[PDB]
Design a protein around this nucleic acid. Structure first.
Ligand SMILES: C[C@H](CCC(=O)NCCC[N+](C)(C)C[C@H](O)CS(=O)(=O)O)[C@H]1CC[C@H]2[C@@H]3[C@H](O)C[C@@H]4C[C@H](O)CC[C@]4(C)[C@H]3C[C@H](O)[C@]12C
Ligand SMILES: [Mg+2]
Ligand SMILES: [Mg+2]
Lengths: 1114, 176, 315, 52, 94
DNA sequence: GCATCCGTGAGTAGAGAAGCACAATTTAACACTTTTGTCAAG
DNA sequence: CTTGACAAAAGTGTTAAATTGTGCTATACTGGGAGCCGTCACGGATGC
């Protein structure tokens, strides 16, 4: 099956590593491989050099170097033992006695740094996790216009998040400039005097604008000394504190001049110098040297604000949503920030520990307590919003999750504060953030994906590549450049015709500061690398993207993540060219390290004899359960003795076919209504799909149970469960666990556990019951683990971890834990959700036998029937073009690669359809068959609909229909043809993770809440359905008073009513009259706890006791 | 309908020395075409014992009386040096498509039920032409095209189909 | 709708004969089509009305089963004691309503025979049946319409191909005409006759009119050349789609708005069938994101409003 | 809409208490003041003056 | 739709009165084991069971069909509630 | 009259970091009868 | 149907260890700490 490639744009550079946003950022933070003496002042190395040295003010604790040891356990062991894949951290510290002059050095153990895997994820407590990158306003100096009053501008100084206060400079109507700090507004003149500025200095610099300087020349404080002006400012900031020079200087220094508390950041410092045209020595608003304050940024900030207000040409306002003003915090920065917080907490503990207790005899090991450092690190990787449970339904799911950009999280935004501006597609998202990929709903515009060619720089600004154009010729020089730098050039489109390297078109479509313009070739300075850089990886996997509406392209890209791996997964007939790169960069498949020969091939492992001679054995991940329950296995794709080159595929990963991403099946699709089973996005499939095991997926469910220490005796995991027969214990082995390979159904025991019964005398009816039968009550009860309803399958793995095992850190009181893995082979059934890459989704509503499906005249039935009514409103025409191209490739036996926006056009598809007709119909002629009578009838209608040209032969008219993607289709039920030609072709359809098997739930009676006594929620807890306010409104509107009262009382929280209702039903009786809900009783008692006398009265205003006399004191 | 492999407990496992896992092997076995030469034969068990390194095919099953393998060249598994494959494949006779969850046939404890597609017919197409006789030209020429796996010839399948329809037409005889 | 819409032909439309036999003779030679509008003496008729006169609906539908006529061909059928010039499909629809309500005379008054059955007409039929017959008979009628509606849509031959989104020949003329007038605005702008905002408003009005004319051309092309086109039939019947969505598939995408709300000067000149360019797709992405953001915030505001209304009028 | 608008106009403001215990500017339902006025007129006392 | 639902709605001034009458009659039928029914033996509702054709156990179905016959009298303050319950028990023992 | 701070509200489902001494009180191990419960005897 | 007497079961009174509660440490030490932030409109009051 050959692959035909479409497209005319030549990409000079390939896609960058798709996980480099995760991998490279964490490498830069750790710096684990670079020797300590060559480590740069970034990452956790910067954290050590910032908090250290710790001075008592004559004991100094200095930092020299750190090192990271090898992880205690491998990644597979951490997953199996619920451990964190982490590396021990040791810091080599020295304690300096400034009085004596003696230095003692030792290496202290600071804890464990979690390690990133090769694919770019973390294993936290045995679970795979991904740290999502965060987007926020970049630090620096910004100048936005005052909305309340026109003609006025406000200066904003933003440091790194949680690394200083936000500062506002505004020109008050009185003419004096004001500085707002910590919600306290005060005149900047006072602070500006503190930093050593006289009357002539301000006039010499800011006096060339107009009346603005006159409001900055209040001589009431200019004659005042800076020292008392510093104290005077200290009173305004925090009023009431006793004015002391030592305390006042510390507060001001810690507010704007302390690098340990205020940090403008490398990105913030660079933005400040670029905007104000200055050069900062550090990353603080001011420096404190020689016992006095020197200005760093306030004067240039006020100079810019005055010039902006005056109206000089070189000054302009700042768009805060401009992507040059928004930066990305990657995993390395997020971990480093939390590492610094923990290090600061550790330093504070060291400082308070080094000022008391055996001062002469102190060591860095004794002073340093690493628990605050570990607690902050553990908190970040476990309970942070940006630390998310890894989505690994399929390899594309994990790849997307690592490239996600979130505006939420700690230090970011909340939906309430997220308006139409942070949620919108800014013009600078072009080539940096995918415009279409985003979660529809409350998260639209807040969680986004990095563009395919985009990369995050050191400062956190997303750069996109462009080809340099000089003299009208497009060169191979590629420049990665930010949005603010992009605004300075005229950038042409990647589709501009070129004769070699010279631009051929006289009129070139280009962008100038995001606006589309028509320019000459000599005015073009840069060119787009490819159409693919505008979109993310998921969107780049949608063929004929240019023919789909953006709202439906959003759905198609998102649902590719939800596709489950299939046992017979196939790469799509129509591809975009990124299928191989997604598999390669996801690290789910296995490739040869260099050239060599395969020595051993097995389902468990592959051994390759490389040219250098070393034997490398690659264990194969087999039937591994992902975070979503999908089975992730690698199947070998080589044979013994086969010669492989460097990078050649050795074993396909999940949802991959010969190194190509395979998220679904390639099936024959007929676009036509079918008896209402296609109604409103419903999908009709053939039974032939189940016969050959398409859309069949393997899912593994994990069940866990613990044997605990109890005050009544310890729980025992054993096969001897009281009061059960041999049939219930048939599949349990001698240890009480179900045997591996046994088929389990709901209600079957997975593992037997007996718990000692609580000491409680039995009811007299039970006592007589045991007395009659002469059976002594046992001391243990059945607390074994059973299959929940609607679940089951085949037991494939049993994991038993016991207390005292190496590396097994069980919680106290737990003797052992048993984990059982149950695998089920799920076939496609009614209610399962199918989707394609173009946003067309629906559930299977009907499965037909092969003889019922519409079939081709040659006898080939279709596989899937799709409703044509889902096309016109959704405006996603790419599925139609995929169907047309798929039809041609079905008969020509070939697949196609059509890149988005540069690929197969209709003239190219129709000429392929012409060749496909010669095998579709030319084969029929050779076999000795003419034109069907049924085909003649369809052609008679076809010329009446204007689909074929009158006067042509039936063969020519059939060819005309084929070039339109339409064929004569017969009804399998009647044998008669469909009255009009039907678009029949081959389309790639995915099976999504939303399955009716995991979503069906029902409950009659079950667990109830502790306080409200209402049924719990969720299928896992066997809970009831929530009957909310709107559902109550529906019954009120219907007038169903008694139906409403049952749900309020009899079925939710009437303890007496629900017990009596159940007993009445099982006796064949009608349910009794309901009583007061228990939630109302809770409300009354809670209202009484608020010192409110709430009493229910009768017709005569007399109190009525709704507590049955149980709360009345005698 | 059922397959048992020595030292294999379920279908979600791999066999040492065998490139394919049990799921893939079962998928290969679903393509096996077995022809019963005895009309009274209802169930047969095919025994396969192979040792690596070899590419075990459908022809490597032990011969059975009145049983013929119609596709001896079908690939079953790839054996690596040091790998062994001892299988007991049970072939039943039936109609329609019976999933493994319905019949659940296990000849022994570790036998794996297999979804069964008993239909030998692979594809059917019928063609109608404009034939003429005498002075009337609206007559029909019917041409039935039958593709079968080879265990049943297309002529036999057509004869059985005619009999099934003929028997169903006798159901309209006695009114109630 | 498919079985109730009548076919219109143009092979011999507007040609006049003298006797009905002469009109039938022309149809035999292929000069005039079966449903082509003709005049026998002074009355506008067609070949199908004269050639096929059926004594009852059963005979008319028997001919359809035997392939002589289609459900959409206009013929002569005697029904309810009246000589009706309608199609068998329209006669078939009358029998569907009559058998569903088990009353032939009342069902005759409940339907509009001489129009294709669309969303509004079917809604009117359901409401009229409810008033005259009650819920129980209306429910049976609804099930009968559902059964036949699903049955005929399956065998109708309704599909969606790329050629079904027919591009009118007037789009190229309008785009060239708009380009010529676009240069006029730019030429006048350089002459000082109009300001910057006047130029911006002039371009938007030019493209707004061009967008509307293309929409008319798309539906006019369907009306005269492809009356049974899938997109046209779905839009006219009220099943799926609106003229705005049909234009984006067959005409042009149109003007797009910037994130600030300002409209881009250059519209997206390509439809979904032709395929947008990379720049046009990104330009259209601002509106798609804005619409989705509007939808998310509107549901909370609408739900909040509903709860206020419930809590003020619940008594 | 009229059902909701009816609830939006349900309250009135007292402009002149008259011979009642109400206060000028007090807000109360329209029905109550009309019912209160009926008793006041039925005994000769000054009715409450109110505005919608 | 329920059989004769249009006729059921036409016999009451308020549609919710029909529901009250049907529900109260259904519990009267359930209380007395369908022995107080006004339906003739050929008029009793039936359901199809594998063993055979048996009486319909749904009293709501019985109550709706009884009201269609017209042998039931409904209204407010017809008879005292205590007198009604006692008299039905006597003439229809259960 | 107006300008400002505070308070209120913003859709529904589901799935998810001191020892130590000593006294005072309680627990648990004993012994003890004393008490039910029970199997011979009539 | 009473012995009756008899061992187990249960109650009970000491006594011990164990657990728990409380007091007390004598160079001099004398005003904290973390935040600090991207929504918007709406009453309602509180003063100016
Ligand atoms: C008029 C005819 C009766 C002839 C007679 O008794 N004299 C009745 C008896 C049974 C009826 C059909 C079935 O209900 C199934 C189906 C129900 C849908 O709702 C409408 C379509 C169907 C096909 C019906 C059509 C029509 O209504 C039938 C043929
Ligand atoms: Mg077979
Ligand atoms: Mg005639």
């Amino acid at each position: 099956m050959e692959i035909k490639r479409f497209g005319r744009i030549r990409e000079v550079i390939p896609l960058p590593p798709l996980t480099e946003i995760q991998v490279e950022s964490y490498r830069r933070a750790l710096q684990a491989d670079v020797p300590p003496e060559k480590r740069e002042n970034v990452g956790i190395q910067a954290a050590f050099r910032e908090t250290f040295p710790i001075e008592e003010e004559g004991l100094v604790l200095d930092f020299l170097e750190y090192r990271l040891g090898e992880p205690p356990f491998p990644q597979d062991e951490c997953r199996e033992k619920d451990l964190t894949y982490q590396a021990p951290l040791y810091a080599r510290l020295q304690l300096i006695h400034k009085d004596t002059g003696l230095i003692k050095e030792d290496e202290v153990f600071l804890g464990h740094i979690p390690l990133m895997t090769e694919d770019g994820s973390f294993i936290i407590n045995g679970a795979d996790r991904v740290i999502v990158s965060q987007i926020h306003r970049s630090p620096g100096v910004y100048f936005t216009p005052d909305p309340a009053r026109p003609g006025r501008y406000i200066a904003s100084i933003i440091p790194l998040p949680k690394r200083g206060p936000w500062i506002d400079l505004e020109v008050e109507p009185n003419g004096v400039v004001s500085m707002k700090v910590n919600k306290r507004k005060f005149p900047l003149v006072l602070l500006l005097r503190v930093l050593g500025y006289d009357q002539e200095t301000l006039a010499r610099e800011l006096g060339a604008y107009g009346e603005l300087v006159q409001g900055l020349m209040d001589e009431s404080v200019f004659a005042m000394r800076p020292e008392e002006a510093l104290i005077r400012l200290f009173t305004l900031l925090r009023p009431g504190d006793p004015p002391k020079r030592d305390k006042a200087v510390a507060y001001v220094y810690g507010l704007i001049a302390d690098p340990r508390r205020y940090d403008l950041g490398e990105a913030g410092r660079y933005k400040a110098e670029e905007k104000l045209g200055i050069r900062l020595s550090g990353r603080t608003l001011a420096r404190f040297e020689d016992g006095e304050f020197k200005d760093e940024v306030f004067l240039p900030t006020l100079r810019y604000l005055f010039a902006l207000t005056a109206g000089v040409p070189g000054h302009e306002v700042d768009d805060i949503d401009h992507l040059g003003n928004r930066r990305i915090r990657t995993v390395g920065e997020l971990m480093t920030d939390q590492f610094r917080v923990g290090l600061a907490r550790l330093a504070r503990g060291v400082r308070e520990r080094m000022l008391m207790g055996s001062e002469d005899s102190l060591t860095p090991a004794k002073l340093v307590n690493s628990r605050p450092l570990e607690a902050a690190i553990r908190e970040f990787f476990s309970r942070s919003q940006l630390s998310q449970f890894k989505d690994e339904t399929n390899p594309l799911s994990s790849l997307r999750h690592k490239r996600r950009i979130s505006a939420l999280g700690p230090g970011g935004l909340t939906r309430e504060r997220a308006g139409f501006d942070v949620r919108d597609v800014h013009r600078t998202h072009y080539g940096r953030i995918c415009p279409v990929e985003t979660p529809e709903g409350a998260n639209i515009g807040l969680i986004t994906s990095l563009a395919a060619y985009a990369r995050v720089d050191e400062l956190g600004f997303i750069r996109t590549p462009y080809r340099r154009v000089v003299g009208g010729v497009v060169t191979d020089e590629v420049v990665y450049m930010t949005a603010t730098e992009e605004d300075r050039y005229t950038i042409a489109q990647a589709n501009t015709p070129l004769e070699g390297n010279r631009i051929a078109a006289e009129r070139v479509v280009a962008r100038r500061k995001g606006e589309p313009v028509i320019v000459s070739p000599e005015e073009v300075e840069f060119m787009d690398v490819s159409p693919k850089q505008v979109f993310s990886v998921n969107t780049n996997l949608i063929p004929f993207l240019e023919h789909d509406d953006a709202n439906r392209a959003l759905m198609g890209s998102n649902m590719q993540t939800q596709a489950v791996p299939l046992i017979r997964a196939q790469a799509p007939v129509v591809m975009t060219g990124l299928e191989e790169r997604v598999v390669r960069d996801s690290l789910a498949a296995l490739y040869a390290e260099e050239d060599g020969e395969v020595a051993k091939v097995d389902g468990n492992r592959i051994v390759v004899r490389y040219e250098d001679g070393r034997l490398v054995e690659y264990p194969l991940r087999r039937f591994y359960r992902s975070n979503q329950g999908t089975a992730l296995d690698q199947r070998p794709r080589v044979v013994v003795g086969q010669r492989v080159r460097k990078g050649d595929l050795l074993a396909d990963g999940p949802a991959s076919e010969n190194g190509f991403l395979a998220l679904g099946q390639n099936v024959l699709v007929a676009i036509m209504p079918f008896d209402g089973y296609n109604f409103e996005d419903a999908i009709v499939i053939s039974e032939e799909l189940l016969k050959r095991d398409f859309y069949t997926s393997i899912h593994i469910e994990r069940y866990e149970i613990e044997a605990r220490d109890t005050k009544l005796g310890p729980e025992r995991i054993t096969r001897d469960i009281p009061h059960l027969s041999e049939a219930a214990l048939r599949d349990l082995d001698e240890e009480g666990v179900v045997r591996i390979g046994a088929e389990v159904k709901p209600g079957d025991i997975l593992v037997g556990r007996t718990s000692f019964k609580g000491e409680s005398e039995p009811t007299p009816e039970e006592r007589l019951l045991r007395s009659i039968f002469g059976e002594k009550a046992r001391d243990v009860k059945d607390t074994s683990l059973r299959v929940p309803p609607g679940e089951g399958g085949i037991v494939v793995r049993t994991v038993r971890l016991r207390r005292g095992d190496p590396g097994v850190e069980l919680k106290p009181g737990v003797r052992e834990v048993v984990r059982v893995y149950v695998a089920q082979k799920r076939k496609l059934q009614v209610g399962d959700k199918l989707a394609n890459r173009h946003g067309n989704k629906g559930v299977v509503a009907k499965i037909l036998p092969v003889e019922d499906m519409p079939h081709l005249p040659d006898g080939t039935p279709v596989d899937v029937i799709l409703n044509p009514l889902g096309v016109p409103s959704r405006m996603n025409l790419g599925q139609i073009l995929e169907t047309h191209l798929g039809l041609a490739g079905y008969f020509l036996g070939q697949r196609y690669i059509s890149p988005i926006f540069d690929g197969a056009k209709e003239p190219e598809i129709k000429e392929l359809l012409a060749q496909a007709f010669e095998v579709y119909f030319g084969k029929r002629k050779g076999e000795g068959f003419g034109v069907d009578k049924r085909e003649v009838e369809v052609l008679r209608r076809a010329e009446k609909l204007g689909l074929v040209t009158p006067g042509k032969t039936p063969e020519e008219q059939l060819k005309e229909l084929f070039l339109q993607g339409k064929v004569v289709l017969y009804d399998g039920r009647t044998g008669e043809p469909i009255e009009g030609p039907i678009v029949v072709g081959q389309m790639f359809i995915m099976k999504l993770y939303h399955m009716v098997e995991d979503k069906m739930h029902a409950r009659s009676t079950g667990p109830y809440s502790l306080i409200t006594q209402q049924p719990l929620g969720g299928k896992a807890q066997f809970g009831g359905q929530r009957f909310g306010e709107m559902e109550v409104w529906a019954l009120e509107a219907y007038g169903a008073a008694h139906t409403l009262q049952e749900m309020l009382t009899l079925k939710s929280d009437d303890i007496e009513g629900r017990n009596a209702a159940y007993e009445a039903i099982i006796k064949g009786e009608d349910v009794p009259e309901p009583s007061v809900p228990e939630s109302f009783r809770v409300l009354v008692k809670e209202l009484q706890a608020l010192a409110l006398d709430v009493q229910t009265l009768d017709e005569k205003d007399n109190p009525v006791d709704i507590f049955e006399g149980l709360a009345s004191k005698r | 309908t059922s397959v048992y492999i020595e030292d294999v407990l379920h279908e979600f496992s791999t066999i040492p020395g065998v490139k394919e896992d049990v799921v893939e092997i079962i998928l290969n076995l679903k393509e096996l075409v077995v022809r019963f030469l005895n009309p009274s034969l209802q169930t047969v068990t095919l025994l396969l014992k192979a040792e690596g390194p070899k590419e075990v095919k459908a022809r490597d099953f032990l011969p059975v009386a009145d049983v013929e393998i119609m596709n001896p060249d079908l690939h079953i598994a790839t054996l690596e040096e040091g790998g062994r494959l001892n299988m007991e494949v049970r072939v039943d006779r039936g109609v329609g498509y019976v999933p493994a969850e319905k019949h659940g046939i296990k000849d022994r404890i570790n036998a794996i039920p297999v979804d069964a597609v008993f239909s030998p017919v692979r594809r059917v197409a019928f063609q109608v032409e404009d034939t003429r006789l005498g002075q009337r030209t609206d007559l029909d020429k019917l041409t039935l095209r039958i593709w079968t796996d080879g265990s049943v010839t297309p002529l036999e399948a057509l004869n059985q189909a005619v009999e099934i329809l003929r028997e169903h037409l006798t159901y309209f005889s006695n009114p109630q | 709708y498919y079985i109730t819409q009548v076919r219109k032909e143009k092979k011999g439309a507007g040609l006049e004969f003298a006797t009905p036999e002469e009109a039938l003779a022309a149809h035999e030679r292929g000069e005039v089509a079966l449903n082509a509008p003709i005049k026998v003496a002074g009355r506008e008729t067609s070949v199908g009305r004269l050639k096929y006169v059926f004594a009852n609906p059963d005979e008319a539908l028997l001919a359809v089963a035997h392939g002589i006529v289609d459900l959409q061909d206009v013929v002569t059928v005697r029904y309810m004691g009246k000589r009706l010039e309608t199609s068998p499909g329209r006669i078939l629809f009358a029998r569907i309503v009559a058998e569903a309500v088990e009353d032939e005379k009342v069902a005759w008054e409940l339907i509009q025979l001489d129009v294709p059955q669309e969303k509004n007409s079917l809604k009117d039929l359901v409401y009229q049946a409810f008033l005259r017959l009650g819920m129980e008979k209306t429910a049976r009628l609804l099930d009968a319409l559902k059964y036949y509606g699903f049955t005929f849509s399956t065998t109708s031959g309704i599909t969606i191909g790329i050629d079904d989104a027919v591009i009118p020949e007037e789009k190229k003329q309008y785009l060239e005409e708009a380009d010529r007038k676009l240069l006029q605005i730019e030429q006048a702008y350089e002459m000082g006759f109009l300001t910057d905002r006047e130029r911006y408003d002039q371009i938007l009005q030019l493209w707004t009119e061009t967008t509307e004319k293309v929409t008319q051309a798309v539906f006019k092309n369907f009306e005269e050349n492809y009356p049974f086109n899938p997109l046209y039939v779905m839009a006219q019947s009220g099943a799926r789609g609106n003229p705005q969505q049909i234009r984006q598939l067959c005409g042009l995408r149109g003007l797009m708005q910037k994130p600030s709300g300002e409209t881009f000067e250059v519209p997206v000149r390509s439809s979904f069938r032709e395929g947008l360019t990379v720049l046009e797709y990104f330009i259209s992405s601002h509106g798609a994101r804005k619409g989705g953001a509007d939808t998310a915030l509107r549901t909370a505001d609408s739900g909040y409003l509903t709860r206020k209304l419930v809590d003020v009028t619940h008594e | 809409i009229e059902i909701v608008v009816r609830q939006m106009m349900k309250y009135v403001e007292v402009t002149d208490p008259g011979d009642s215990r109400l206060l000028e500017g007090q807000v109360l339902e329209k029905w109550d003041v009309e019912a209160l006025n009926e008793r006041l007129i039925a005994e000769g006392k000054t009715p409450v003056a109110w505005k919608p | 739709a329920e059989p004769g639902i249009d006729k059921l709605f036409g016999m009451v001034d308020s549609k919710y009165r029909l529901t009250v009458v049907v529900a109260k009659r259904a519990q009267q039928l359930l209380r007395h084991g369908f022995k107080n029914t006004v339906l003739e033996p050929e008029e009793r509702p039936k359901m199809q069971t594998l063993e055979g054709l048996f009486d319909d156990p749904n009293a709501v179905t019985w109550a709706m069909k009884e009201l269609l016959t017209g042998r039931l009298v409904f209204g407010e303050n017809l008879v005292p509630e205590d007198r009604l319950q006692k008299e039905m028990e006597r003439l229809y023992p259960v």
